[PDB]
Write a protein that binds this ligand. Structure first.
Ligand SMILES: CC(C)C[C@@H](C=O)NC(=O)[C@H](CC(C)C)NC(=O)[C@H](CC(C)C)NC(=O)OCc1ccccc1
Ligand SMILES: [Mg+2]
Ligand SMILES: [Mg+2]
Ligand SMILES: [Mg+2]
Ligand SMILES: [Mg+2]
Ligand SMILES: [Mg+2]
Ligand SMILES: [Mg+2]
Lengths: 246, 212, 220, 222, 52, 220, 237, 195, 203
């Protein structure tokens, strides 16, 4: 097994990457929306048993204080990418510059990780696509999709997984370049409501924003130059609040 | 030890003593300090006995292998460079070798390389090497001449090792003589200093520092 | 350098002087010796300044990864084990000497750690060249069940002892207060008892005082 | 500070005859001023009419003899029991020694046997592999006492024919095994008298076409 | 067995010296003889270095 | 899997199939020279890699087959040429260099996870201090041989038949101009043409399209 | 058996290399045109949605250093790997010699990396073709391509990706041996216009030319609106 | 110890290097050439540890020639000197450092200028109008500080070296057995037999 | 020790919307002065780095940092800032903790975004001197400390900063056998950089 398991077929296509995408297309819908003053990323929390506690799992993950991610496809592949992504942000960036990487470069590192699984001997590609929302001082807010191939594209808004065709369509109609974060959150909810079969509340929806710095989440005072984290995940309560007055 | 090689009109003379020592102990007076690598190539040994015997014998192996591989005798330059490259790999380990690599090919002509365990490799017309080198030099240099007859050259080489054997505590035994030409080396015998010294003192009227 | 640690009824206080010295020279007269391992875990260092800073960053980074991985608040004992194991592995050659203080879900903690990898625990501690002067104050004025304001005063008095009596120490007092149930409170230059007096004159030169051979614009 | 080397004293003696060789050693083994053993053999039959002694640091000596005997075993395996000739044994022992050039066996090696013309052979080695074939050689503790004596008695050095005004050397002559043993015995009784590290016993190995034989003689035990 | 008149048959080398007392002839896929010849020569010369 | 039942090596025989698909290459020995000729848009060709490469000042290599495979051999040969100068204090003979290159090829047919070179080569030039032109050919198998004139690649069977009846060992082309012409002729049988002339003691010169066009037109 | 990447077919063909080339022929088209005083790189974007963030990306053209750029066709993630080794190679050369790397030397090294994957190791080749645009003081302006075979050639004009034969024909038609960098731009846009299966949001564009202020060489990665304004002035508006 | 001198004049660089090779109380040779040509317009002279000097210089030469062949282009003096410097900087912190100091004379055919580089074994590099390694700089630097002009012909450079060598034969304690002088210019490298 | 074989000094100072950095020109080998033109100050974009110590390491670090910053600019698509470069220098130095470069680097520059003047110093293994009035380094660092603490005052105009850092360098150098032999001074503002060569004693 010291040979690639992803290889080219006569049509020039790479089967294992395509089949990886198929797995992604089969996953629960998730989406991202970029506003002028923030970005939102969202997904549904299908609990595969009512005896399961879905709060103990997290589909939306903080990567850096200013960068978060969500996914469609194979959950465990995602979990593992999250661990790798957090580490590479420290090992190839923060330990050298004393700064967290800007979004596009962190997206780029995760892309490398995924590209590698499509070429190295003895391994299948990752079966996930990630949406990654971040902010950095010189580029502002951004939003990227990474695919099992390691390809990444920047979006103003997009959806992935099962209900993505209708969701991308809904988003095409409602999106304009003057949404404020609150609009983007509202639109994300309306969008997720189509994809959602079954229950739809603050407990089956996961939602996070990259927005303003939160000094109250820093954990300490005294360094005034120290920026709060821009990433915040919305509580169950906060999500229901918006849902009632939808 | 005293060893010398020089180029002159009739080719190369090679001359060595045969004493080996440990501290002030004369361990032997019969040591062979020239190696016959092939019929056109000689090596001389000064410094560590083992270091010299071992590595020059090994050099002989590398030379033969070259011949099997390239279907030609190796050049003097390349043979001396094999030895030089090898010792340099060991630089600092504590090897102790002062050697001369001497011979003929048509390309180079009669050729002498000095090679030591420092990595020093030198082409030259005259070298004396060993604890007695300065004594050899003083005699050899004084009477050296490019147009020495072959006989006069053989004698001057012999007389120079003899001078070193007499004065250097660590040289002695006998003199081994070689002549090298375009047809390769030819051996000119082993000359015990025990009888050589007196013979030369008489014939020559030299060594007046000594009671006869 | 003078660093101390002082536990109180509801947390721990850490403090340091602000002088760093190239030999008998002061390089930085207002340096920062109070480092953050994590939001509520802070450490002060003496010994080799690069080692103290580097090892701080290494563990801080790892503590952060650990915390993200385990979805738990970092624990002071974790910083302790990671640091001592790292320092021990290096057999003393990383000359870091640290007082590490903090609060976490299990309570409030105070530890010291030496270059070879040994660690101590107590209610009050000192390290660095000025630690004997500071410890003399601690040994004279510590009592169980300090309030926050009393532990600040005591730690601040201890740093002062080193500032005044230890040539290795000087300038200002910095404190960090880590109280249970609250954000860590970092007080930079809590005390500044060593301001330079006004000089007798300005040494501004008349323009053109300095001889120039040639001049040119550089393009960035 | 660990010193990996020791000195176990002892002295050895090889003389070549026309159709025989002899390798002798004393049987005493020492440490500083103590006697470890009055009888610990150090001259060994290694097969193929090859006898060997590695004298000095006895731990290195034993190791070297062991490695060599093994070398013979494999020579035989590789070459259908072909006799290892003595010159071939010598070159091989050179390599064993020089293999450890940077951490040498602290010993003086002598081997004796017959050459391919059936003539007695002695070879002498320095601790790192330098060797020559010789007619006689003493090694070890009392070598500096015994060697000049052999120079004089085995090779007639400094003897002239009387009435010739010191112009005619006493001509070289092959000694018989009888005359050689006499010299060996006298060398050792002499060494025993003047060297504190020599005594107890004298073991002589005698090699001929018919094989290796052994004689033993007591030496003074003080 | 020159495969063409343009081949300089002098460079067809299917017999080689291993040592002064040993030579050899090869037949087959002859490029494979490279290693064998090399190894043989080294075996012969190494045996002489070690055993005289 | 490796050998067919009649004893061929599969991958090696397949390597020969690669050479056949390659562009035609030919070399011919004159009395005091050796010419190399190769065949070939909208491409820049002053910067594009040529089909003939200097190995050292006096030796060249050309090839037919998998183009990209040939760079590894060219590079390996150039390095060895310097190693040889460095250690023997003399440049390679053409024959030596050919052994080296062919030996590399043979090796790639006997290592695991490694494909044989899909190139055959022409190696030509003059030994140091010698004016007998030298010409060798190597194959993916690692076989090599000396030739008065030789061709490799597509339609080499055609070109070879041409040289067998137009090259006379008794009278090799007596001038560089004849030698070039015969080379150009040999190519026009199956042919944009490259020509490189090698004369003794490092006279290596590639003919421009111009001087080549002066040749081809006259022939026609 | 054509799954295995470093073994010959019975026709002496290398299948994985050939299939990698098939994949590339389905990628977004990239053109490169060399003028007397500059070079032009153009890439038509494979992916199109209206929600794609067209500005702030450039994902088919890449600066390798101050003097050399590439245009990509194939797996963009494959490309990034090799782009990164190249930038490193160029920096090592600068560090060793204190000179900028000659374009061909950077090209040969990447071509060698590609070649390696075809001869040993059992890993699939990279699914990318590159058009290299660069300047050095030895050869002036240069254009090269490389493909998964590990081959590379120099060009006066060239294309890779989809519809390559259609593009090559047009370029063979309207290429003057000594044009001007502003015309080569026009030609490039026309040729991408005649093969598009064409707006600014679907284009990436770059140039390398003498700064005219002065004597120096400049790499411009055109912004989206710049692409607009150059799309109208050449009558594709 | 070894004399190694360099003077860069208007149209050329000139290298002068002592002929003696001395071990203990023996001058072994009086005709030793302490240079290797790295390329047709680049020359390197060398001083330092026995063995290291030739081993280093030839290694560089081999590498430079390799580049010449691979690129069919001659690297600039500036590029070569930087490769030499880097090799020495790697050396000094390697398991066994070359103890070699070098001078590099080259004619930049593109810039049409002579350049002279002094690089020691640590990897310290500097370009200079004149340079020296060893104890010789203790006499030559001040002498040339007095006598050297920037406008000088090759012949004047030669006179300048006659002055230096005359002084070193006067004041240096060791008999360095004269020098070999080599001129590097637009036409390449040549040795001045009549020195 | 290695840090005093070649000799030389660097000093940097902040002023009002400006920074300045200066160095001598000497390269010697112990008592022998060798080069009269060995500058010790480099720049990567708008960030300046001065380096004292062992000349070979001075040169090595420069090349290492040009390499690192070039890659940074390519990947980040913007030039490195003085704050970020400072951390980069630190960690690069610390990476060689147990076999260090024998150097005393100094960073000066103006952040392109805040417009804020920035300086820093380092010990040979990367410890950062965060100080923001002045930083000194080299074989005359004592002298420099003395000169700076004396002559310096905050918020000097560039024209005045030029006189101050000049006199600090010149007078420190003349009390040091291993420093001097010429000097260069950079006055750095947002839109302009001026380099000047000072006239000084040549003994
Ligand atoms: C070819 C040589 C025989 C030339 C001759 C003089 O140059 N050399 C010698 O005579 C040198 C002495 C010299 C290095 C001062 N002697 C030697 O090399 C002798 C070998 C003879 C005694 C058989 N070996 C030696 O001195 O001791 C080696 C040693 C190594 C490790 C531990 C204990 C002892
Ligand atoms: Mg035998
Ligand atoms: Mg006794
Ligand atoms: Mg007794
Ligand atoms: Mg200092
Ligand atoms: Mg001074
Ligand atoms: Mg002075």
């Amino acid at each position: 097994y010291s040979f690639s398991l992803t290889t080219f077929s006569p049509s020039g296509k790479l089967g294992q990457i395509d089949y990886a995408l198929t797995a992604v297309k089969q996953g629960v819908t998730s989406l991202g929306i970029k506003a002028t003053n923030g970005v939102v990323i969202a997904t549904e929390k299908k609990s595969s048993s009512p005896l399961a506690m879905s709060e103990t799992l997290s589909k939306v993950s903080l990567l850096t204080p200013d960068i978060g991610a969500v996914y469609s496809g194979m959950g465990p592949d995602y979990r593992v990418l999250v661990d790798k992504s957090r580490k590479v942000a420290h090992t190839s960036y923060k330990r050298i510059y004393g700064e967290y990487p800007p979004t596009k470069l962190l997206v780029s590192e995760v892309a490398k990780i995924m590209q590698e699984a499509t070429q190295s001997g003895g391994v299948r590609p990752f079966g996930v696509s990630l949406l990654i929302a971040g902010h950095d001082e010189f580029n502002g807010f951004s939003l990227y999709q990474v695919d099992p191939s390691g390809s990444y594209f920047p979006w103003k808004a997009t959806a992935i997984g099962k209900g993505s065709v209708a969701a991308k369509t809904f988003l095409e109609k409602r999106w304009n370049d003057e949404l404020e974060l609150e609009d983007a959150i509202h639109i994300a909810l309306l969008t997720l409501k189509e994809s959602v079969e079954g229950e739809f509340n603050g407990d089956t929806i996961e939602l996070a924003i990259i927005g303003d710095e939160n000094p109250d989440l820093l954990g300490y005072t005294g360094i005034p130059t120290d920026k709060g984290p821009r990433f915040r995940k919305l509580t169950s309560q906060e999500i229901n609040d918006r849902l009632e007055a939808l | 030890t005293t060893t010398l090689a020089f180029r002159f009109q009739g080719g190369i003379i090679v001359a060595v003593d045969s004493r080996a020592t440990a501290g002030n102990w004369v361990a032997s007076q019969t040591v062979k300090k020239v190696i016959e690598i092939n019929p056109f190539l000689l090596g001389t040994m000064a410094g560590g006995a083992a270091d010299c015997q071992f590595w020059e014998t090994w050099l002989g192996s590398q030379c033969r292998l070259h011949e099997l591989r390239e279907k030609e005798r190796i050049s003097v330059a390349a043979a001396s460079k094999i030895l030089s490259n090898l010792v340099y790999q060991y630089k600092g380990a504590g090897l102790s070798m002062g050697t001369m690599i001497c011979g003929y090919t048509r390309k180079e002509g009669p050729t002498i390389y000095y090679v030591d365990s420092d990595g020093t490799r030198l082409k030259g017309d005259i070298f004396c090497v060993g604890s007695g080198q300065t004594f050899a030099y003083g005699v050899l240099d004084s009477n050296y001449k490019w147009d020495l007859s072959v006989e006069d050259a053989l004698y001057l080489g012999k007389r120079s090792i003899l001078a070193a054997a007499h004065r250097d505590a660590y040289s002695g035994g006998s003199v081994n003589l070689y002549h090298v030409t375009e047809d390769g080396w030819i051996y000119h015998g082993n000359h015990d200093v025990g009888e050589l010294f007196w013979k030369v003192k008489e014939e020559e009227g030299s060594f007046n520092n000594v009671i006869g | 350098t003078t660093i101390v640690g002082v536990k109180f009824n509801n947390g721990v206080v850490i403090a340091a002087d602000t002088r760093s010295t190239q030999g008998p020279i002061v390089a930085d007269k207002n340096c920062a010796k109070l480092h953050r391992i994590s939001p509520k875990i802070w450490c002060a260092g003496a010994g080799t300044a690069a080692d103290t800073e580097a090892v701080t960053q290494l563990i801080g980074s790892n503590i952060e990864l650990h915390s993200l991985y385990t979805s738990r608040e970092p624990r002071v004992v974790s910083a302790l084990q990671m640091l001592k194991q790292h320092l021990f592995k290096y057999q003393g050659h990383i000359g870091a000497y640290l007082i590490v203080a903090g609060v976490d879900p299990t309570g409030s903690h105070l530890f010291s750690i030496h270059a070879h990898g040994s660690t101590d625990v107590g209610y009050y501690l000192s390290l660095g060249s000025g630690s004997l002067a500071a410890m003399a104050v601690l040994e004279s004025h510590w009592k169980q069940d300090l309030t926050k304001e009393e532990a600040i005063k005591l730690a601040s008095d201890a740093i002062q002892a080193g500032i005044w009596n230890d040539l290795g120490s000087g300038s200002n007092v910095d404190v960090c207060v880590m109280e249970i149930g609250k954000d860590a409170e970092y007080l930079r230059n809590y005390l500044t008892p060593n301001v330079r007096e006004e000089k007798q004159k300005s040494y501004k030169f008349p323009r053109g005082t300095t001889a120039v051979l040639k001049e040119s614009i550089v393009n960035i | 500070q660990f010193n990996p080397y020791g000195d176990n004293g002892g002295t050895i003696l090889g003389i070549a005859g026309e159709d025989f060789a002899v390798l002798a050693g004393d049987t005493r083994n020492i440490t500083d001023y103590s006697i470890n053993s009055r009888y610990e053999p150090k001259v060994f039959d290694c097969g193929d009419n090859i006898v060997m002694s590695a004298n000095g640091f006895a731990a290195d000596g034993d190791a070297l003899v062991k490695r060599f005997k093994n070398s013979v075993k494999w020579y035989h395996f590789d070459h259908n029991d072909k006799k290892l000739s003595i010159n071939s044994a010598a070159r091989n022992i050179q390599h064993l020694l020089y293999g450890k050039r940077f951490f040498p066996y602290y010993v003086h090696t002598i081997i004796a046997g017959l050459d391919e013309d059936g003539k007695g052979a002695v070879y002498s080695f320095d601790p790192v592999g330098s060797y020559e074939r010789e007619q006689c050689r003493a090694g070890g503790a009392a070598a500096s006492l015994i060697m000049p004596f052999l120079d004089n008695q085995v090779n007639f050095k400094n003897q002239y024919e009387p009435g010739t005004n010191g112009k005619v050397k006493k001509p070289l002559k092959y000694l018989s095994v009888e005359e050689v043993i006499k010299l060996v015995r006298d060398s050792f009784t002499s060494a025993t008298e003047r060297h504190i590290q020599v005594g107890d016993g004298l073991e002589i190995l005698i090699v001929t076409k018919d094989g290796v034989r052994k004689e033993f003689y007591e030496l003074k035990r003080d | 067995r020159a495969t063409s008149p343009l081949l300089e048959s002098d460079s067809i080398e299917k017999i080689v010296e291993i040592d002064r007392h040993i030579g050899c002839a090869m037949s087959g896929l002859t490029a494979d003889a490279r290693s064998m010849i090399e190894h043989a020569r080294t075996a012969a010369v190494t045996h002489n270095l070690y055993y005289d | 899997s490796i050998f067919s039942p009649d004893g061929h090596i599969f991958q090696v025989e397949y390597a020969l199939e690669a050479v056949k698909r390659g562009t035609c290459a030919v070399g011919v020995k004159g009395k005091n020279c050796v010419v190399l000729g190769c065949e070939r848009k909208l491409q820049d060709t002053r910067i594009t890699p040529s089909k003939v490469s200097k190995i050292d000042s006096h030796v060249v290599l050309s090839f037919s087959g998998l183009n990209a495979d040939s760079r590894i051999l060219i590079e390996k040969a150039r390095v060895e040429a310097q190693s040889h100068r460095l250690t023997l204090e003399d440049p390679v003979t053409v024959e030596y260099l050919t052994r080296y290159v062919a030996g590399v090829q043979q090796r790639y047919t006997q290592s695991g996870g490694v494909r044989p070179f899909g190139v055959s080569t022409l190696i030509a030039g003059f030994d140091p201090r010698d004016d007998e032109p030298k010409l060798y050919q190597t194959e993916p198998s690692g076989i090599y041989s000396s030739w008065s004139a030789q061709t490799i690649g597509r339609n080499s069977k055609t070109v070879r038949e041409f040289l067998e009846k137009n090259y006379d060992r008794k009278e090799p082309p007596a001038t560089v101009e004849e030698c070039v012409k015969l080379t150009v002729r040999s190519l026009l049988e199956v042919v944009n043409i490259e020509i490189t002339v090698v004369k003794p003691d490092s006279d290596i010169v590639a003919l421009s399209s111009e001087e080549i066009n002066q040749y081809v037109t006259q022939i026609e | 058996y054509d799954s295995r990447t470093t073994i010959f077919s019975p026709e002496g063909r290398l299948y994985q290399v050939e299939y990698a080339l098939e994949s590339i022929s389905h990628a977004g088209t990239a053109i490169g045109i060399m003028a007397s005083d500059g070079i032009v790189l153009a890439a038509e974007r494979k992916v199109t949605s209206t929600l794609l963030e067209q500005d702030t990306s450039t994902e088919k053209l890449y600066k390798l250093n101050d003097k050399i750029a590439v245009a990509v066709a194939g797996l963009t993630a494959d490309a990034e790997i090799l782009i990164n080794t190249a930038r490193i190679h160029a920096q090592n050369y600068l560090k060793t010699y204190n000179e900028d790397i000659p374009v061909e030397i950077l090209v040969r090294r990447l071509s060698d990396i590609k070649q390696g994957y075809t001869q040993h190791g059992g890993l699939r080749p990279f699914g990318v073709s590159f058009i290299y645009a660069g300047y050095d003081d030895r050869y002036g302006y240069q254009l090269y391509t490389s493909n998964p075979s590990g081959n590379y050639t120099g060009w006066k004009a060239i294309s890779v990706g989809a519809n390559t034969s259609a593009a090559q024909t047009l370029l063979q038609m309207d290429y003057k041996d000594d044009m001007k960098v502003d015309d080569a731009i026009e030609l490039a846009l026309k040729t991408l216009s005649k093969t598009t299966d064409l707006t600014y949001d679907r284009l990436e564009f770059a140039t390398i030319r003498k700064g005219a202020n002065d004597g120096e060489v400049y790499q411009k990665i055109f912004k989206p609106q710049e692409i607009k304004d150059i799309l109208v002035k050449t009558g594709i508006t | 110890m070894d004399i190694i001198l360099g003077i860069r004049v208007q149209d050329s660089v000139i290298l002068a290097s002592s002929k003696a090779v001395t071990r203990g109380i023996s001058v072994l040779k009086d005709s030793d050439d302490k240079t290797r040509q790295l390329s047709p317009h680049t020359l390197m002279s060398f001083a330092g540890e026995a063995g290291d000097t030739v081993q280093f210089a030839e290694y560089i030469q081999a590498n430079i020639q390799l580049y010449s062949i691979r690129e069919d282009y001659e690297l600039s003096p500036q590029a070569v000197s930087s490769f030499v410097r880097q090799e020495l900087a790697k050396s000094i912190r390697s398991r066994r450092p070359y103890q070699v100091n070098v001078l590099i004379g080259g004619y930049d055919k593109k810039k049409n200028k002579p350049e002279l580089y002094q690089i020691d074994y640590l990897g310290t590099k500097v370009e200079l109008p004149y340079g020296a390694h060893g104890y010789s700089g203790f006499y030559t630097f001040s002498l040339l500080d007095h006598h050297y002009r920037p406008d000088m012909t090759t012949e004047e450079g030669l006179d300048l070296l006659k002055l230096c060598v005359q002084e070193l034969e006067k004041r240096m304690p060791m008999d360095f057995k004269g020098v070999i002088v080599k001129i590097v210019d637009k036409d390449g490298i040549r040795q001045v037999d009549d020195f | 020790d290695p840090s005093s074989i070649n000799g030389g000094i660097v000093v940097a100072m902040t002023g009002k919307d400006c920074v300045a950095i200066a160095c001598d020109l000497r390269l010697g080998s112990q008592s022998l002065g060798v080069s009269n033109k060995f500058e010790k100050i480099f720049h990567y974009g708008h960030v300046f780095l001065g380096i004292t110590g062992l000349a070979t390491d001075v040169t090595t670090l420069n090349e290492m940092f040009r390499y690192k910053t070039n890659l940074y600019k390519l990947k980040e698509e913007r030039a490195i800032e003085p704050e970020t470069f400072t951390q980069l220098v630190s960690s690069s130095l610390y990476e060689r903790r147990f076999g260090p470069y024998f150097v005393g680097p100094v960073v000066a520059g103006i952040n392109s975004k805040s417009g804020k003047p920035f300086i820093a110093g380092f010990d040979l293994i990367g410890c950062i001197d965060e100080a923001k009035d002045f930083i000194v380094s080299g074989t005359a660092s004592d002298q420099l400390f003395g000169m700076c603490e004396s002559l310096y005052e905050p918020n000097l105009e560039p024209e005045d900063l030029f006189e101050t850092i000049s006199q600090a360098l010149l007078n420190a150098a003349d009390r040091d056998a291993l420093s001097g032999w010429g000097a260069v001074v950079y006055i750095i503002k947002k839109d302009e950089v001026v380099k000047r060569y000072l006239k000084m004693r040549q003994d």
